[PDB]
Every structure is written in structure tokens, then in C-alpha cells.
């Protein structure tokens, strides 16, 4: 249609609020103050296409996974109501994170003020994915140790809310704070080292390794490090400027890594409930 027509522009002609990654030389959407043109742009080829679909698709994948999990027969749970509530909080944080991300990446080029509002929601979503993911994990690890379980939930909440309050700062969105952003979220996620150490110094090195928790927590740590390292350093567009504009740039890979990370985190706590279901809800040991 001949309505709301636009062409991709090079980086140097973008306004300062749109300039973010200088290694993405061309394929930029121009400032378009129309949500009609913004949502319509989803079907077009530009820097944001990959960022958008990885989290638009990821959002509906987790929406389906979330619904399918709530309709699981209550036979397969020890406490089906509270066990569905902890899984629900993870899926909730996972859906909100992806929703805010694909929405931000879509409306990004609307206004300087629209991008300021949705960028704050984009950062807030990440913190919600991290807090929500801890909920089922602490519930299963510290099952017959309720007192420490609830303490760690207060800790991650206070750190998660501090992350949300810091992401509402204007200087946080500036490209000079790319590493600060990666560090704030990386530290929040890596704070799981505290309950992990408690788990291994209470249940032992044998029980933590036999159940797979150690090997699984190492893979998660790797995804956090590799995802932050890529995002902060801008690899590989730093090495091939102008060659990774539409595909495989650091932000797009980090997006892929979020849905991949959230899926393997679900697989971990999914095996933690399967294991608890076999042993029962009792406290014999």
C-alpha cells in the first residue's frame, strides 16, 4: 500500500536518541511517529527485524508452554496448587519479559519519549524474568528447609526491585552504560551463587551433583556470562562493521540467548519437580 512508506537509512543520519550501536552501519528505520507504521514495519527488513521476531515468537512459545503447564493433571504434583503458582510466576515473568522486549523493539523508532517509556519496560522485563525464574528453583532446592528458602526470596526481591528502580534512570539508557546495564543484570542473575553455596554446604557435594543441579547451574552461569559478554562487547559487529546489520548482531544473539536460557532453566526446575514427585513431599531425612 502507498500509505506510511519509508526506506532504511544509514546510521550517521539517525537522530541522537536513535543512535545506539555504531557498528550497525545501514538498514535503520527512520523516526516514524505512527504506531501504524511501527507495527507495520514488523514485516519489513531492517536492523530490528531479528530482535522483534525472536521475542515475538518466544513470547507465544512461552505463552503456549505456560497454558499447557496449568492444565497438567493434578496427579503429577505433590502440592498441585502451590506448585502451579511457582511455575506460574516463572512463566509470568518470562512472558512479560518477552512482551515488553518485542513491543519496545517495534515501537522504538516512534518518538524520543515513546522510546524512553518502552526502554524502561524492556529493562524492567529482564529483572522480572530473573526474579520469577528464582521462585520455582528456591521452592524445590530448599523444600525441606523452608526458613532459608523464604530468606533468599526476600533477597532476590529486594535486588530485583533495586534493578527495576535503577533502570528507570535516563543515564542507564545511554550507550555509554552498555557495560553497566550488562553488569547490573549479570550480577542480579549471578546472585544465585549465594543459595547455590548454601544448597551444596547443607545437602552435600554428592547430592547436588547426583541430582544434576551442579551441572545445570554451570550451564546457566555460562549463558549469563556469554550473553552479557556478547551484549556488552558488541560481538561480532565490532569485527565486521556493516556486515552484520540485519543478521547475527550482538543484540539479536542476546535475544536468542534469552529464550534459549529461559527454556533450559524451565527444563532444570521441570526435572526438580519430577524428582520431588518420586520421593514424595515428606521430610524423612
Amino acid at each position, epitope marked *: 500500500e*502507498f500509505e*506510511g512508506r519509508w526506506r532504511v537509512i544509514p546510521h550517521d*543520519v539517525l537522530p541522537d536518541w536513535l543512535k545506539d550501536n555504531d557498528f550497525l552501519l545501514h538498514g535503520h528505520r527512520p523516526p*516514524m511517529p505512527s504506531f501504524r507504521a511501527c507495527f507495520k514495519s514488523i514485516f519489513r527488513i531492517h536492523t530490528e527485524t531479528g530482535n522483534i521476531w525472536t521475542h515475538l515468537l518466544g513470547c507465544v512459545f512461552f505463552l503456549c508452554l505456560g497454558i499447557f503447564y496449568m492444565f497438567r493433571p493434578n496427579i503429577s504434583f505433590v502440592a498441585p496448587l502451590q506448585e502451579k503458582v511457582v511455575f506460574g510466576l516463572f512463566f509470568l515473568g518470562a512472558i512479560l519479559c518477552l512482551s515488553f522486549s518485542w513491543l519496545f523493539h517495534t515501537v522504538y523508532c516512534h518518538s524520543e519519549g515513546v522510546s524512553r517509556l518502552f526502554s524502561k519496560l524492556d529493562y524492567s522485563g529482564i529483572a522480572l524474568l530473573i526474579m520469577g525464574s528464582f521462585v520455582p528453583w528456591l521452592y524445590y532446592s530448599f523444600y525441606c528447609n523452608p526458613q532459608p528458602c523464604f530468606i533468599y526470596l526476600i533477597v532476590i526481591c529486594v535486588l530485583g526491585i533495586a534493578a527495576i528502580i535503577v533502570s528507570q534512570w535516563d543515564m542507564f539508557a545511554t550507550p555509554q552504560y552498555r557495560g553497566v546495564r550488562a553488569g547490573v543484570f549479570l550480577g542480579l542473575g549471578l546472585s544465585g551463587i549465594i543459595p547455590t553455596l548454601h544448597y551444596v554446604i547443607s545437602e552435600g557435594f554428592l547430592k547436588a551433583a547426583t541430582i544434576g543441579q551442579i551441572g545445570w547451574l554451570m550451564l546457566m552461569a555460562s549463558l549469563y556470562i556469554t550473553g552479557a559478554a556478547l551484549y556488552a562487547a558488541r560481538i561480532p559487529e565490532r569485527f565486521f562493521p556493516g556486515k552484520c546489520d540485519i543478521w547475527f548482531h550482538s543484540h539479536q544473539l542476546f535475544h536468542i540467548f534469552v529464550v534459549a536460557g529461559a527454556f533450559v532453566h524451565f527444563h532444570g526446575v521441570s526435572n526438580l519437580q519430577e524428582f520431588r514427585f518420586m520421593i514424595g513431599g515428606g521430610c524423612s531425612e
Partner: antibody, heavy 118, light 107 residues
Framework: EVLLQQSGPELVKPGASVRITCKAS????????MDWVKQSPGKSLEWIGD????????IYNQKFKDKATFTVDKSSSTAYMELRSLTFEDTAVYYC???????????WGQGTLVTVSA | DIQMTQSPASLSASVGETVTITCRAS??????LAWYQQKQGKSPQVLVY???TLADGVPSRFSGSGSGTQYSLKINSLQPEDFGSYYC?????????FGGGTKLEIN
């Protein structure tokens, strides 16, 4: 600095055909679209059409479809607008304007005055 | 076609005064509006694009506002160089249309 340099004034007979030159400089020619605007004496601006130096595609205003033709020389970075079978109504200042993603014009040629005299 | 209507047709205001030129569209143009100034015998110059964004070099005196079909260009503290013909343009749909113009005349 971006610079759109247009051809000099023309004084043509009725029925003849003019060709306006638009030398673009100071940027990568194919990155943006080029538009053509007509300004009748003491009158408002009128859009003739847009041209894409990269694809070749050009969208004309229905009013001028049979009157104007947009052509290009990518090598010299020069846009052309050819007006066919001129009439007294065609006596106007013709500008070339560059787009910047969306069709708003930050860069304008100095204009070419086409005078149809008999 | 989208008819762009410009009002007032002309106005004369003293230096230091605030003036408002309005512009209407015959249908929604989704903020894809631009304002241009034109000095006699000179090429037009963009002032405001995307309804409210000020172009580089343009002073803060110029202020773009509006939404949907009704738009405005307010000039605070008029200066002797502000004389000329003002034009609004929609770039939402083809053919891109301009307003008739407003002739501003400083005295």
C-alpha cells in the same frame, strides 16, 4: 555538506520537451529517494513524484504521469526529470528535493525556471 | 488525494510577537507532517518534520504541535528574518500534498 545543484533556466516553445538536471553531491546517492516539486508563479508547491536511485522505481502523481519522466545516471549521481509537450501552464520553478527515510525534504535544489513562451 | 488547508492566508505582525499558523488535513496523516519556510526567490527550507521535531539549525522559537488532522506552527518572539511564505506538507500518503501557504510579513 549535502548539495543538490540544478540546471539553468529554460525558455521553450509550446509542444517542446525540457530536461532538468539535478547533480546530487556530499552523500551516497542511492541511500535516499529523490523527489521533484513544481512551483507555479505566485502559487503553492506541487508534488510531481518520487524516484528511487537504487531500485529505479518511481511513483508519479496522477496529474503529471503523462507529463514527467524520471531518469538517472548512478555513475554521475545525477537525477533527471524530463517534461514532455509543454504548455503555458507548465511555466513553473521545478525543484529536486531529497528524502531522509520518510518523504520530508531537508535538502532542496536551487530550482530550475522553465518558461514556456511562443 | 489529501487536501491540506492552510490558515491564515496571510498575516502581518510586529517584531517580538507570537503567531500561530494552523493546517488541516482532509484525513488522518498520522503525524507525518512537515513545515517549510520560503524566502522570496529562494528554495524552501525545512523547519519542522514529523509534526513536532525541529530540524537542525532551526531556532527554538519555532514549535510544532498537533495530531490526526489538525496541526500548528507557533513562532514565539518574531524576528525580522522570519518574514516569508510558510508551507505545511503531508507525507503520509501519495500524492504528497502541500498547504496553500501563509504569507508572514514582519513590520
Amino acid at each position: 555538506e549535502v548539495l543538490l545543484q540544478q540546471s539553468g533556466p529554460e525558455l521553450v516553445k509550446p509542444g517542446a520537451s525540457v530536461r532538468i538536471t539535478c547533480k546530487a553531491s556530499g552523500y551516497t546517492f542511492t541511500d535516499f529517494n529523490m523527489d521533484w516539486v513544481k512551483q507555479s508563479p505566485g502559487k503553492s508547491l506541487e508534488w510531481i513524484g518520487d524516484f528511487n536511485p537504487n531500485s529505479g522505481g518511481s511513483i508519479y502523481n496522477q496529474k503529471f504521469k503523462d507529463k514527467a519522466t524520471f531518469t538517472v545516471d548512478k555513475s554521475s549521481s545525477t537525477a533527471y526529470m524530463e517534461l514532455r509537450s509543454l504548455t503555458f501552464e507548465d511555466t513553473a520553478v521545478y525543484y529536486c528535493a531529497r528524502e531522509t527515510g520518510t518523504a520530508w525534504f531537508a535538502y532542496w535544489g536551487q530550482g530550475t525556471l522553465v518558461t514556456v513562451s511562443a | 488525494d489529501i487536501q491540506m488547508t492552510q490558515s491564515p492566508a496571510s498575516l502581518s505582525a510586529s517584531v517580538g510577537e507570537t503567531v500561530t499558523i494552523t493546517c488541516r488535513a482532509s484525513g488522518n496523516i498520522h503525524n507525518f507532517l512537515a513545515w517549510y519556510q520560503q524566502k522570496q526567490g529562494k528554495s524552501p527550507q525545512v523547519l519542522v518534520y514529523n509534526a513536532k521535531t525541529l530540524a537542525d539549525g532551526v531556532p527554538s522559537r519555532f514549535s510544532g504541535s498537533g495530531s490526526g488532522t489538525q496541526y500548528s506552527l507557533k513562532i514565539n518572539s518574531l524576528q525580522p528574518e522570519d518574514f516569508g511564505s510558510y508551507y505545511c506538507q503531508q507525507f503520509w500518503s501519495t500524492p504528497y500534498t502541500f498547504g496553500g501557504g501563509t504569507k508572514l510579513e514582519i513590520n
